[PDB]
Symmetry: D2
Subunit: 232 residues, 4 copies
C-alpha cells in the first residue's frame, strides 16, 4: 500500500488498495494513519464500489449514521470524517477544495494562537445553535485545529463587525492556496477527509449539469479546547 504525496500541507493519493468489506485490519490502519497525517486521501480506479460496498468499508474506519464549511458544525457532535464517491460527474468542472485546519493553527503567530485558543464561536444553520471553540484538540492525533467555516454566525462576547472581520482573517489563512488541495474528480474516485482537521468547499462551475455524489458520513465526537472544555 503506497501513499503518494499531493501537496506540502495537505493531500495524498493511495494506490494498491481495493476498498470493500473484505479488507485486512493492517491495511485499514495504514489508511487511517495516512488519513490523520495528510488530512485528506484519495483512491483512483475504484469502479467496484456500489452503495453497499462503500458502507462496508466505512464500517471498518468508523460508524455510519458552495462555501467553505466543516460538515454540520451547527451540531454539537459533528461527524469525524466522510467517504465520498463519484458516480456521475459533469463533462467539465465540479472539483472540490480541502483545507488543512491543523496546519492553519500551527502556522499562526503566537498572538493569533493566544486569540484563537480563548475564542469561542456560535455555529448555526441560520434551529440548531452550538457554541464551539475556535481551536479544538484533536482526540486521536492530539493536534490543535481551527474550527470555523460558513456555519459560524458570531464569536462569543464580540460584536458583528469584530466577528465578521476576525472570521475572514482566520478563513483567509485556512483557505490560502498553499494550505489547500483541489481535486479534479473522475469516475471511480473516492475521497476520505478527516473532518476534525479539515474544511471543504464544492465549486459550482459546471453550469446546469447533473452531479450525483454518494457520501458516507462517520460518527463524530464532541470537541474540547486546549483547557478541556466541551461545546454547548
Amino acid at each position: 500500500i503506497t501513499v503518494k504525496k499531493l501537496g506540502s500541507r495537505i493531500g495524498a493519493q493511495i494506490d494498491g488498495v481495493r476498498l470493500g468489506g473484505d479488507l485486512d485490519p493492517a491495511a485499514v490502519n495504514e489508511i487511517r494513519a495516512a488519513l490523520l497525517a495528510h488530512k485528506v486521501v484519495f483512491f483512483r480506479g475504484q469502479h467496484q464500489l456500489d452503495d453497499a460496498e462503500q458502507l462496508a468499508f466505512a464500517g471498518l474506519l468508523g460508524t455510519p449514521i458552495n462555501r467553505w464549511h466543516t460538515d454540520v458544525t451547527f451540531a454539537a457532535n459533528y461527524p469525524a470524517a466522510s467517504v465520498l464517491r463519484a458516480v456521475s460527474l459533469p463533462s467539465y468542472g465540479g472539483s472540490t477544495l480541502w483545507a488543512n485546519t491543523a496546519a492553519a493553527y500551527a502556522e499562526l503567530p503566537e498572538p493569533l494562537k493566544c486569540l484563537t485558543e480563548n475564542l469561542w464561536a456560535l455555529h448555526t444553520n441560520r434551529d440548531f445553535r452550538t457554541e464551539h471553540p475556535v481551536v479544538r484538540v484533536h482526540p486521536e492525533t492530539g493536534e490543535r485545529t481551527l474550527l470555523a467555516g460558513d456555519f459560524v454566525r458570531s464569536f462569543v462576547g464580540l460584536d458583528s463587525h469584530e466577528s465578521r472581520v476576525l472570521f475572514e482573517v482566520l478563513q483567509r489563512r485556512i483557505t490560502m492556496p498553499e494550505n489547500t488541495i483541489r481535486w479534479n474528480w473522475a469516475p471511480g474516485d473516492v475521497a476520505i477527509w478527516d473532518n476534525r482537521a479539515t474544511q471543504h468547499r464544492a465549486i459550482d462551475d459546471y453550469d446546469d449539469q447533473h452531479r450525483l455524489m454518494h457520501r458516507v458520513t462517520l460518527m463524530g465526537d464532541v470537541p474540547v479546547d486546549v483547557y478541556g472544555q466541551a461545546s454547548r
Copy 2:
C-alpha cells in the same frame, strides 16, 4: 483539432495539435479564438517543444518581449504584455500547481453599482503607473477588471478605502467558481490572456526546485470605457 471546456467561466484544453512554427494560419485561428474565449488554454504532451520551437510558435501569436500572489504580469508597467506561453521544463514530485482567474467574467457578473464604481475607478500599480480598474479588451471588446498584487492604492481613495475595496474586487475575481487550477505534468503548455486574466503560483512543494520556461509577448496600453489611456 478539438478544444474542450474545463470550467464554466474559464479553462480549455486544446488537443490534436503539435505546437510549433509549422502550424498553418487556420490552426492559429483556432488557438486564438479559444484563447480569447476561454482566457486560458492548455496543451498536453508537447514534448517536441524546446526554447527555439516555443519562441517560433509564440511569434505567431504576437511579438515576444515568488509569484504566489494573485497578479496580472507587469501591471506596474504601462504597456504590460498581452499573453504568455509558459511551459513545464522540470516540476516537483508533488504540488506546484497554478491558478487562473477570469477578470472579464468578474466584471460581467458585477452588480450595476460595482460596475459604476469600477468603470470610474483608477489604481496605482507599482513594485508608478496609473491604470483604470476596468479596461476594454482590444480584440474581443470585453470589459475586464485590472487589479492584482501590484496595486498599491486607488486614486481618490485613502489607505483604508483602497484596501477594503481592493479586497472586495479580488474576492469576486479569485472566487473558485471563476478559476481553473492546473496540475502541471511533463510536456504541458499553458497560454493565458494576460489582458483578461489573473494568475497565482502555489508554494505547496516545500523546498523543491521548479523550473518554468516562459515566453511573454508584446502588449498594448490599457484604455477605460471612456477611452482614457494609462498615465505614468
Copy 3:
C-alpha cells in the same frame, strides 16, 4: 436673528430667539433657512419652553406626529426633522453627535458617487417594518443629494453579506468622520433641531447608569426619491401617519 457657525460642514447656534408658538413668521424662515444650510441648529437658555409650548413651536416648522442612525428609516416616509429639548441631564457626559450626509455625498470620489447613486439599502426595525431606500436621496427642499444609511440598514440590494457590511462601513466612516460632525454638550434648557433628511445622529452613553431625559417632537417627513426619481419600496409595514 444672529446665526453663529459652529463647524465647517455642520453646526450653528442661533441667539436672540425665544422659542414659542407665537413666533414671528419671518423668524420661522430665519430658523428654517439656517436648519437647511447648517443641518443642525442649537438654542440655549430656553427655560420657559415646556412640553405644551414645544409642540406649538414644532407646528410652525412642520407637522407633529447608542449607534449612528437616521430616525425611523425602517419606515418609508421617515421624519423630516425633530425638536429635542433637555429636561434632565446627568452630572457629566451624555453629549450627542450629528453628521452631515449632504456634505458626505458632496465629498465622495466620483466612483463612490457612481456607486451610491445606484446603490439601494434594506432598512428594518428587527412590529415588522422593512423598506428598500435609495442610498442617495435627493432632498425635496434644498435639492441636495444626501446619503441615507445608518444602524437600521440591514443589507444592500444585489450584494452579499460581506460586500454589504464592507461598503456600509466605508460610507459610515466618511459620514461620521470628525471633520463632518458636531458634538453638542447639553446644558439645562437647550434645544436642538436637525434636518433628518440630511443628517445622522448618535447618543453617547458616557454618563454611567445615570438619569437622562429629553422630550422630543418629531415632524412628519416624505418618501425619499433617488437621482433618477424612484420612490422607496415598502416590503412590510405601513407608512407613518398623523
Copy 4:
C-alpha cells in the same frame, strides 16, 4: 482645588487654580492624581500664561524636551509621557481636539483580544529615520494600568502580513476611538489641556476651513514602554 468629571471613561475639568511655577506640592499632587485618573485634564480661564510661565509649570510635572488619531512621537522608543497644550490664537469656529482613553480600551477588551494585544508587537515609524518596535500593550509606570499602544505611526504588526496588520489595527482603533471612550474639547481663549500620552490617543479636527490656528505645547520626557511580561521596546533605527 475642585475637579469636575467630563465623561465616565475620560475627561475632567479642574477649577480653583492658576497655572504657574509657584504651585504648592499639595496642589500639583492633586493635578497629577487627576491627570492619571482622568487621562486628560482641562484648565479654563488661564489667559495669563506666558510661554515662560507655561514652561515653569511643566517643570513641576516632568522634564521639558495632525488630523489622525495618534500618540505623540511613538516612532521614538522613549516617547513623551504627557504634554501641556495652550490656546493662543483660535479660529472663528471649529478646531476642537479629540482624546481617547487607551487604558479603558484595553480593560474592556474581551479575554481573546487581551491575549492578542498582550503578545502583539507593532512597528512604529516616522515615514531622520526613527523606527521602533513597541508592544501593543504597555504597563503604565505610575498607575500600573495596561494601556493600548498604537496610533497613526504604526506601520505594521510583527508576525502578521499587510492585510492582517491593517485589519487588526482598525479593529483596535475602532474600540479606542469609540465615542463613549472619547472627549471632544471646544477650545476657548486661555484654555490649557494636559493629557497622559502614555495612556491616550488624540486627534486634531480640521473643521475650521483654512483659518489661522496657533497652539503652543510643552511636551515632557517619558520612559520606554514595557509589556506585561516586562520586555522593553526595541530601537530598529
